[PDB]
Each structure stands twice: as structure tokens, then as C-alpha cells.
Ligand binder design. Structure first.
Ligand SMILES: O=C(CO)[C@@H](O)[C@H](O)[C@H](O)CO
Ligand SMILES: [Co+2]
Length: 290
């Protein structure tokens, strides 16, 4: 059956924060998974990586990692120095993941994010470098039983993989057993003709699903077709990870990277965000036919 998570960034204005409080929180909320930022792991002291692994084991919580590579670590760059620096950086992230007991890394691990359209790009050249880089990283990942999740993003955030057709073509070309597609309701809602059809199309390639409303509020506060999404997951016999990715806070690096320029929380306290996420999880489980 499916396992449910949340991204810690629901509560935070920064990517690089302590994650321990969120392991205890997701256990209290009856979630199966905490997704953490790779940027909070890569330079974390060894003792704190071990403490995070032990706390997750104590609470029987699965940890996953999210990443959007910065421009200086663009593994799709036509600049060999940038490409190599990005590969060095993701290998360090994977080393830290291993110490924290983390096996899944998803997001823009295959290019840079958020994309900057102020300068030119070469989509074919970037795609070719991206595939070569991801194959090298997939091979490195095997020693730690790590899976790479290639996220399909809207046109404003990236240019390489904007729909399930492009992401499936890319992942089939990469041709590595530990490289899979990640779909995201926010992104699918912009680029797909029909969200449930995109999930069915992706099928066996779907390694993880991010969920949120169209404006990234918690599920139940918007208009997403939750029953149709649930049916599509049944149609492909999905028993994988469903991670809530709500972004309702303006400010900090998180608000600037997600481009949220107004409060969507009604100035909610942390306690109110907890209550709304619990309500949302019950709503999602009901819509998905749990
Ligand atoms: O959907 C998004 C970005 O719009 C997130 O899942 C992001 O890609 C991940 O946090 C890695 O940065
Ligand atoms: Co996402």
C-alpha cells in the first residue's frame, strides 16, 4: 500500500535547517516519510547524520531527499568544469545520504533549478550532457542502493522535461534501473492535458509523486482532481511514495525559489499548519480509497 510523506520546507523559510524536529513531527502526524533538503545534509557533521538516521529508525520514519542543483553545479552545462563540479557535489550529497540512511533523491538532480531565462540555452546540448551526467551518478548511486527521481517541472522552472512524455523519453534513454520519473501535481496541472492520464502514461516509470493544490496549498484547499488522481494510482498499481509538498509561506530562500510573493497561510502558526496537514492527509487518504 502507499506510503505518505511531507517535505519539511512546509514549515521553513530556508533549505539548510536541522531536520530532527521534523522526524518527531511526522511521526506525531502519522506520516510514513519525511523528505529533507539535500542542501541540509551535504555539509552536516557525521555525528548529526548518524543521529538523524538513528532518530528515523527509532520512530520507524523513512527519510527521502529533495534537491534543486544551483547553477554552479549544473550537470547539464556545456561548461565541462561546471558539469564536473556538479557531479562532484551530487556524489558528496549521496555520501551524506548513505550516512543518514537515505535511499531516494529527487528533484532537479539532472540540470539546475530554478532556471534563469535571462541568458541563452541549448536544449538539445543540455539534454545530451544531462543524460551522460545522470548515467554517471546512477552508477555511483548503486554502492548505496540509491534511486534518482527525475522530476517533471513546469516551463517556468526548467526547459528540459516539462511533461510526462518528455520525462518518460528521457528516463528510457538514460536506461538505468535506479533512475525513475517523479511527477508533481503542481507541475502536471500546468503542462499536462489531463493529470490522471499523465500518471497512467508514466506507469512503471513512476518512482515518486509530489502532491499539492494548484497554488501549492495543502490538498483539500483547492480544486485538484484528487479522486481521478487516486484512480490513476490504482490503475498503475502504485504502492510507492506520495509526498505532500505544500508551500504557503512568503520570505526566505524558500519563498524566493518557489516565487511566492503573498502569504497563502492566513498567517498560520506552526500548530495550525500541523492541524491543516493532518486534516489534508485524512482527506487525501479518503480520496485515494485507503
Ligand atoms: O516541485 C518542486 C519545485 O517546484 C520541488 O519538488 C523541488 O523540485 C524539490 O524540492 C527539489 O528542489
Ligand atoms: Co515537486
Amino acid at each position: 500500500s502507499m506510503k505518505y510523506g511531507v517535505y519539511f520546507a512546509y514549515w521553513e523559510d530556508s533549505w539548510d535547517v536541522d531536520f530532527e524536529k521534523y522526524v518527531r513531527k511526522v511521526k506525531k502526524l502519522g506520516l510514513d516519510i519525511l523528505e529533507v533538503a539535500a542542501l541540509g545534509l551535504v555539509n552536516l557533521p557525521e555525528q548529526k547524520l548518524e543521529r538523524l538516521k538513528q532518530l528515523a529508525e527509532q520512530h520507524d520514519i523513512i527519510l527521502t531527499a529533495g534537491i534543486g542543483l544551483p547553477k554552479e553545479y549544473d550537470v547539464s552545462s556545456t561548461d565541462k568544469t561546471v558539469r564536473r563540479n556538479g557531479i562532484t557535489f551530487v556524489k558528496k550529497v549521496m555520501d551524506a545520504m548513505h550516512q543518514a540512511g537515505i535511499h531516494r533523491i529527487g528533484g532537479t538532480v539532472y540540470s539546475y533549478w530554478p532556471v534563469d531565462y535571462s541568458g541563452p540555452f541549448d536544449k538539445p546540448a543540455a539534454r545530451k550532457h544531462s543524460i551522460e551526467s545522470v548515467r554517471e551518478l546512477a552508477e555511483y548511486a548503486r554502492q548505496y542502493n540509491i534511486t534518482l527521481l527525475i522530476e517533471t517541472l513546469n516551463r517556468f522552472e526548467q526547459f528540459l522535461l516539462n511533461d510526462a512524455e518528455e520525462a518518460v523519453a528521457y528516463v528510457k534513454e538514460v536506461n538505468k534501473p535506479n533512475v525513475k520519473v517523479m511527477l508533481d501535481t503542481f507541475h502536471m496541472n500546468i503542462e499536462e492535458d489531463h493529470i490522471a492520464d499523465a500518471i497512467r502514461y508514466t506507469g512503471d516509470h513512476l518512482g515518486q509523486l509530489h502532491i499539492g493544490e494548484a497554488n501549492r496549498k495543502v490538498p483539500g484547499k483547492g480544486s485538484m482532481p484528487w479522486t481521478e488522481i487516486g484512480q490513476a494510482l490504482k490503475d498503475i498499481r502504485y504502492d510507492g511514495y506520495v509526498v505532500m509538498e505544500p508551500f504557503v509561506k512568503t520570505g526566505g530562500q524558500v519563498g524566493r525559489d518557489i516565487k511566492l510573493w503573498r502569504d497563502l497561510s492566513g498567517n498560520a502558526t506552526e500548530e495550525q499548519l500541523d492541524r491543516e496537514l493532518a486534516e489534508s492527509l485524512e482527506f487525501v487518504k479518503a480520496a485515494f480509497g485507503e
